[PDB]
Swiss-Prot record, chains A, B, C, D:
Residues included from the entire protein: 30 to 144 of 147
Effect ascribed to mutating Y105H: In CTS1; amyloid deposit on carpal tunnel; patients show no other abnormalities
Outcome following mutation: C1R: In AMYLD1; amyloid polyneuropathy
GO molecular function: hormone activity; hormone binding; identical protein binding; molecular sequestering activity; protein-containing complex binding
Phenotypic consequence of S68Y: In AMYLD1; amyloid polyneuropathy
Reported impact of A36D: In AMYLD1; amyloid cardiomyopathy
Primary location group: secreted
Mutagenesis / variant outcome for changing E45K: In AMYLD1; early-onset amyloid polyneuropathy
Cellular localization per UniProt: Secreted; Cytoplasm
Annotated protein name in UniProt: Transthyretin
Protein source organism: Homo sapiens
Disease involvement: Amyloidosis, hereditary systemic 1: A form of hereditary systemic amyloidosis, a disorder characterized by amyloid deposition in multiple tissues resulting in a wide clinical spectrum. AMYLD1 is an autosomal dominant form due to transthyretin amyloid deposition. Protein fibrils can form in different tissues leading to amyloid polyneuropathies, amyloidotic cardiomyopathy, carpal tunnel syndrome, systemic senile amyloidosis. The disease includes leptomeningeal amyloidosis that is characterized by primary involvement of the central nervous system.
GO terms under biological process: negative regulation of glomerular filtration; phototransduction, visible light; purine nucleobase metabolic process; retinoid metabolic process
């Protein structure tokens, strides 16, 4: 599993459950193609988005739909979503964990890249 | 001044100087129009992006060009840029400060909305 | 002003107002002496804690009383306080800004050291 | 396992390996008693610090020795350590994951509390 997403809720101290995640890949003409999507689990994790075969070198965008998450909890947040844009596998195949820590007016994101 | 950006470097403990910043506004057909841009100052700040007259309600995107910043310092970073996408809402007079704290493989962003 | 503290609330998107802040300095026998304290202003800031004369090299602790802040807002928080422990070093004229971004179950802290 | 610690390095995009962690519990006379300690694994995790039986209600401090970590990498950081102080099990037995994201001049900490 080369690409995993983990989302945490800093208001409740819990995994952020059922958060929509969309992944896009930049295509040959400065257009962004849909690549994968899913919802985070009860542990705040999203696995199985892609395979090593399909996850080729390129520029990827991970969109985490934070506004819909906070609104479901009755909170009107600042951000529409959290976005993580990066080049993948430009130095060989890597495993990527994209983590996000969510608050209504702030988020932190971190990438753990392992070989 | 209704929209200010502040960028900090968590590796050097300093303002992030000469960072390119681009602001976009979502247009009537889900397309994004260039709105304002600049480079951060010696204090890590960018002021004077817009006026109260032009900064109307809408969806805005602030892109901070973090990869070029780290490459200038000799550090190999993860993200292409840091992105902050948000709705501006008239709920009384508001000033928006978008702050970002930068590390090579992580960033934190915060919005301070004051009257 | 060589030591300033800035505290922000990531739930409200605002300065954290009327937060108690305590500063300690490590003494010659691994004991911690009270050094300065105050409450953050309407801008989330605390200035005037010390002078250049008294702010000598040493180990310092900044305690931010986050639990009392969240309890005043009706939010059940995790931490008793946020703590920032650091060495001050003479390497040219330096000003220290200690910033903290607060959420109920998370905080981020940053030190900006400028000349 | 009711108390786990996870430490990440935001400069390298990796788990923070072999980081010393010390846990203290506040005792009856405003003194802090040593409770547990260890080093993070290759995954940046520290498990097995305590048992449900021994992890009683109280105020705990988790000290993460970040300065020694950065110095081993040749970096002189700002903080002596990252510190996380909290009340545990004051609402029944919980499982606590204390996570820290480390940069030379900034750190973020988050608690995931699960039942």
């Amino acid at each position: 599993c080369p690409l995993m997403v983990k989302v945490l809720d800093a208001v409740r101290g819990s995994p952020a459950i059922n958060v929509a995640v969309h992944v896009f890949r930049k295509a040959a003409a400065d257009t962004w193609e849909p690549f994968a999507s899913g919802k985070t689990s009860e542990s705040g994790e999203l696995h199985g988005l892609t395979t090593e075969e399909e996850f080729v070198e390129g520029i990827y965008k991970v969109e985490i739909d934070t506004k819909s998450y906070w609104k479901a909890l009755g909170i009107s947040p600042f951000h529409e979503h959290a976005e993580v844009v990066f080049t993948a596998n430009d130095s060989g195949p890597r495993r990527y964990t994209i983590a996000a820590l969510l608050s209504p007016y702030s988020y932190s994101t971190m990438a753990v890249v392992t070989n």
